[PDB]
Amino acid sequence: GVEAIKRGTVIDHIPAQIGFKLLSLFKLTETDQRITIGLNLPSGEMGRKDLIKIENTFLSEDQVDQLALYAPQATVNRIDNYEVVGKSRPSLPERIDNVLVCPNSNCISHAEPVSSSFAVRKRANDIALKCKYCEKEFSHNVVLAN
Amino acid sequence: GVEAIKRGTVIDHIPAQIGFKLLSLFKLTETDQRITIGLNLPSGEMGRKDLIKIENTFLSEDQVDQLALYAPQATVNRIDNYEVVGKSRPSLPERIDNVLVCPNSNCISHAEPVSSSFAVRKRANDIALKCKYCEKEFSHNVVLAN
Amino acid sequence: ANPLYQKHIISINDLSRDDLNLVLATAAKLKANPQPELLKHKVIASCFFEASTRTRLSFQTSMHRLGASVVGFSDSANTSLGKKGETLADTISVISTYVDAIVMRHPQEGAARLATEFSGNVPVLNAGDGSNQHPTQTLLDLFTIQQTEGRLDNLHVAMVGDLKYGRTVHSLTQALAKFDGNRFYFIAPDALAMPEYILDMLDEKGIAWSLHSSIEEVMAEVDILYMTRVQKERLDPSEYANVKAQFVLRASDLHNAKANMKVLHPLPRVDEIATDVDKTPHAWYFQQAGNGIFARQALLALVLNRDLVL
Amino acid sequence: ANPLYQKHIISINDLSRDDLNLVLATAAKLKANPQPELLKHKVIASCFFEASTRTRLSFQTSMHRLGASVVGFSDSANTSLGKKGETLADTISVISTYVDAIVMRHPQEGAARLATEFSGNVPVLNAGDGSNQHPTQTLLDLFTIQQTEGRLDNLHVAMVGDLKYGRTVHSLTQALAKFDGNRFYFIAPDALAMPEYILDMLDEKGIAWSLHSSIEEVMAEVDILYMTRVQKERLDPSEYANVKAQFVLRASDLHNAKANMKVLHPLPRVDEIATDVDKTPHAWYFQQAGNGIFARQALLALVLNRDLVL
Amino acid sequence: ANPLYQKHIISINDLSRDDLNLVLATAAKLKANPQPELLKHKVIASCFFEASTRTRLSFQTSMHRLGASVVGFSDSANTSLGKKGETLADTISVISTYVDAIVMRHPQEGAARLATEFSGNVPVLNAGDGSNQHPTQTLLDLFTIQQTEGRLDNLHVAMVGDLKYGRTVHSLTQALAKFDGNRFYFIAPDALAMPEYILDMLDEKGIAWSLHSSIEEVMAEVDILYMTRVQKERLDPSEYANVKAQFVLRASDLHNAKANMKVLHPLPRVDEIATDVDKTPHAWYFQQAGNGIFARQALLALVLNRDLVL
Amino acid sequence: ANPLYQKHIISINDLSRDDLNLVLATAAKLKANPQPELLKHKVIASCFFEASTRTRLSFQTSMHRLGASVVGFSDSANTSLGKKGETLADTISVISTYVDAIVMRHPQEGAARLATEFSGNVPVLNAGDGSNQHPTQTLLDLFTIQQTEGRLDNLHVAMVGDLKYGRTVHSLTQALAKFDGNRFYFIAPDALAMPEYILDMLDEKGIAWSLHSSIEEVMAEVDILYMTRVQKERLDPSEYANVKAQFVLRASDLHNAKANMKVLHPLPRVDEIATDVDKTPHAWYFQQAGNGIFARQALLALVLNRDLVL
Ligand SMILES: [Zn+2]
Ligand SMILES: [Zn+2]
């Protein structure tokens, strides 16, 4: 099945349907290097999971941490020569950039050459994300209805 | 190329970087079945291809033709019992639906709950796409832009 | 003489349940077998001092569908003179001299009641007056509820959206609390809840009501989902966009809905009902806009005709 | 059932020559002996989202001249709501609920075709849609050409002015190239010539055409001089005023014109036809504006009446 | 380099306790002994994309009293900006190719902060960015409190008026929440109450606050009475008037006020402070507008001067 | 007296090769070692009868950096001018009774030149007179080319974009046609091609030019790539988009460009130069706007100063 290549990253244990979000959002397709994706993989250990293998590619630390918001319980696995040489799990990053959208219609991020940037704060029952620009704090549930 | 699934579609010899563009655009990923995807493969011709295996779904004569503006030389092999029970090549449609966007900025399509649609005509060299609504005709290089 | 003959239709509070019922009966009759020359030779004035293209065209189609002539205007601008000097009083005192009935939308609460005092014997009908009344809307709404539910008594009606400022939700509650056994669910953003007096009338008659936070709490109990448009501009854009995971209706949420539940909306519906909702059977707001004809035709037939033979 | 019965009149490309001919026949019949109560009891909506007083009054006179009621509006402003939220789709979905037919002018190419998808069974008729189609104008134009020339086949038609942007000249060419033996002369300022696709349809069917530089080259061959208004503002004022010794028509230039040549113009004609042209017999553009009635009456009689008895 | 040298003053959040003290102490010295040539040969863009004549005239009078030249504009109506493609990022990239500091007012939240990514090394001071910030107004208010009470710590501050949308009351609560032992009384109608995240922030840093119904309740222990404008249009006309007696100050109310108590109000004052309060020692809203000059000069001296040695 | 002393800068046609060199050499010295008191005690009318905030702010920042005072207006909207009789000749005859130099932008071709018959001895600099001239923009462009290529002679200059209406590309072709051995590539869609009288003028003085379809064709030998704005509205929406791939620069296109190549564009830039081109060494449109200051100061120093001895 899909589980190891010579070198690269195996992103394992993504819940169903997030695998394509991650591909899109993190532009992981835009590399002409061997990616194998398997969606709706069985895995009784999940019920249904998704796995992406990017061959000869290593996700620098923070890249891993951005996945915290979407497939939070996924294991990034380093294979830097024929097997699992480093395991990693997503931690919430302190800032999430480029990928989110400001809920505030009257935020200026919307009409301009400006990457979104949000401050992360896991507080109480969720995570609050404060916009760089309009300084307004929203629940990630609002921000991710998107 | 790689190995087989339990009866479904194999779309092979898709131009590299068209692969994902089809997964997203025709929305092939919202299935409960194992979709296995290989990106930027050798083991098929013209260097690196893309490859998609949708398990159990079999794409209609129609959907097969819809790949034609992106994938025209792809092969929509039809699998039963790990062998190609049938082989389809994308032929050009006569109506491409809701995958394209009318370049006409004053075309009403834009602001409304209508799906886009275009009459397709001529073959390979210049493929003129005619908007259903404003009836203005464009070259496919212009329609296939933004 | 019919009960409503030559009566001024100005407020819903003013109409008794008996009169609501006569209006709804007539309307169910005209729909079915319409007499198209009943108001032949009448000249009705469509005086929209505030413009509303839908209403003005529903009312005017009605006048026509019964064989009536129409003279009238539209502001949200200055028509002529009436900007200075022309007091609504002087303007009606001259228009009573011309026509048989006055339909009128005006941007100030109480403009139809003032008009009455100058219309002489000409009946005036309220097509909306500021933030006060819109009887004609509540009538077509009752007709659609009656026509889908088979009754106006013992219903479970969820009212959602701008409950504080929606002219209509205020009136629909007054009309439906003139019938027995009804239960109301009020789902509204905190800052836009049901004003205290609606709720106090509701507790004197002792009608069953409860506030809620999202449609999905009562999805499966609701007979009627009446939705109003949460107006984006009376709110901060970061506050409008932040309410929960919204109170906007998507077909998905209808998944646990009764087979007979209908979703209603005065319209415009910009975003508070999504397109897939339109395809589901529970979709009933365009059908509703069409029942405006028979309701308003009913109204014009009784006010202008002594006895209705149909 | 007549061929066009309950058909949407949206594009000229959509009508076959057989249908063009049925429209023109009926119209020649109604002119002569008009049945004025044929559409009695119909309520037609005149929905001008873009305003055009002439068209709106030609179409509305037609509805009236056949015994029809009319409800409707005019923008080039905001009517009410429909500025935000009201999608044309929601607006038609509510207007299908009221009326029998929808006549509509809208400033966006394809607005009448979208409307179709929400008009239910109500037929919609295109009174102009952006820079795309205006069928009703081409019909009244064919009727005037037929009525003056006795035919629509084997004519020498000179098309002059803004050939690139004139909505009408594009359509008249499509309609006339559905008949045999026609020859076209295209006289236009360099920067405003006939777009390549008109000319390419013309060469597949192999219809005879040629470009020219001034009316006086074909004065004596032309059966029909169709003139469009060169819009001053889409041009530099020093460029508009510098073209040759102009392509504007003066009676003098008519001196070598055939006895049967007619000069046509949609109107406004501000300067491109001079006042003395008005007195000459070749003047036919006001007569043309009047044939708009019978053409549009034809249209409404067939779309709304199963079989025409006249 | 002084701390504020060449920094962009975008939000109060970005200013520390020490930065607030350094701006207020400088305003104190300039009020004292002015420097009319300190910014000579500097050119400042006064870019008011949203018009605000009151704030503009204070900022430009401050720019002039330090010797600088001013160029700029006040759109809202129109000059030629923010239209037909031309983005804000590109405007700032052109403007900071001529000026030494950009002062700007914009209708959208976040605009000043974006300007900052484009000015490069020219400072951007925010004169108002939508419902977000306004640091310069909070700085003149803090300077008025410091000037009149002698301290910014251990104060009794009542915020009276629209506290939900009050951009001013929010920022001054944050600014003042940096100093110690401040205690707050909030007196607002419920529709307009002080939002929860300001309240959360208060609790968290152990600062005390309390809601009160009437100004009467807390007059005796108040040090600073900061009033805000209720914009009538944030309520129905009906709703507005009905608060059983209101949130309007009259000089009768102040009879029990502390000798040092000052009434502050950001202006325009329309109805919440009665005329009779002006001739009271406590009225301090115009003297506050006056110190706008000082707080505004301080900032421009410190941002444009590596060392101010006064 | 220096050559330009007290002359009216109305057109590039009126400036000689030597005058262009004398203005550009002066701008070079002021960029170097500025003169902030050189125009002290002079008052300049910045009269923008047509609004143009971008040009106004550059001209007024230039007036300020030489020490002069500025009075003026920006109509287009309205101030109180050019209305109810009051002619331009009379306005200039009043204004030149107070000011030392008149800078003006007007919507009509020839206005600056007429002002000149009325100012008497006050100089009139033209900031834009309709589709006619704009000398000050051509002077900052020439200064940007001289600054970056080291010369104004023996250059490879591509003009890309609307070349028919491009007031800028016309003037710079004339200015540059005064220096030697310049060679031109014109890349424009045919609807917008470089007018024949510029082309005639080119041929006549033995200067070489060539039309090319795509920017690809000539990237390798280009020195200055001057882009222009296509105003979408000079074409149909349909026409606009359809140029098989377009006239828009992206940084991919520049991969084969000469080490010294600079992309110039008069701004607003909307769509013809993609964002990614900004972070390329070649992008020079904002640094060009920056030199607007210098070219503009040079002129005002030379026109108002009998001898500039720098
Ligand atoms: Zn934001
Ligand atoms: Zn289209």
Curated annotation (Swiss-Prot), chains A, B:
Domain of life: Bacteria
Keyword Zinc: yes
Protein biosynthesis found in the keyword field: no
GO BP annotations listed: 'de novo' pyrimidine nucleobase biosynthetic process; pyrimidine nucleotide biosynthetic process
Keyword tags: Metal-binding, Pyrimidine biosynthesis, Zinc
Cofactor comment: Binds 1 zinc ion per subunit.
Assigned GO CC terms: aspartate carbamoyltransferase complex; cytoplasm
Physiological role: Involved in allosteric regulation of aspartate carbamoyltransferase.
NCBIfam families with a match to the protein in the record: ATCase_reg
HAMAP family: Asp_carb_tr_reg
Quaternary context: Heterododecamer (2C3:3R2) of six catalytic PyrB chains organized as two trimers (C3), and six regulatory PyrI chains organized as three dimers (R2).
Protein name (record): Aspartate carbamoyltransferase regulatory chain
Origin species: Escherichia coli (strain K12)
Taxonomic path: Bacteria, Pseudomonadati, Pseudomonadota, Gammaproteobacteria, Enterobacterales
Swiss-Prot record, chains C, D, E, F:
Cellular component GO terms, alphabetical: aspartate carbamoyltransferase complex; cytoplasm; cytosol
Known pathway: Pyrimidine metabolism; UMP biosynthesis via de novo pathway; (S)-dihydroorotate from bicarbonate: step 2/3
Reactions it catalyzes: carbamoyl phosphate + L-aspartate = N-carbamoyl-L-aspartate + phosphate + H(+)
List of residues binding L-aspartate: K84, R167, R229
Residues involved in carbamoyl phosphate binding: R54, T55, R105, H134, Q137, L267, P268
GO molecular function annotation: amino acid binding; aspartate carbamoyltransferase activity; identical protein binding
Gene3D superfamilies assigned to the protein according to its UniProt record, in alphabetical order: Aspartate/ornithine carbamoyltransferase
Protein EC: 2.1.3.2
Pfam family for this entry, one: OTCace_N
GO annotation terms (biological process): 'de novo' pyrimidine nucleobase biosynthetic process; 'de novo' UMP biosynthetic process; glutamine metabolic process; protein homotrimerization
Subunit structure: Heterododecamer (2C3:3R2) of six catalytic PyrB chains organized as two trimers (C3), and six regulatory PyrI chains organized as three dimers (R2).
Recorded family membership: Belongs to the aspartate/ornithine carbamoyltransferase superfamily. ATCase family.
Function field: Catalyzes the condensation of carbamoyl phosphate and aspartate to form carbamoyl aspartate and inorganic phosphate, the committed step in the de novo pyrimidine nucleotide biosynthesis pathway.
Name listed for the protein in its UniProt record: Aspartate carbamoyltransferase catalytic subunit
Taxonomic source organism: Escherichia coli (strain K12)
Phylogenetic placement of the source organism: Bacteria, Pseudomonadati, Pseudomonadota, Gammaproteobacteria, Enterobacterales
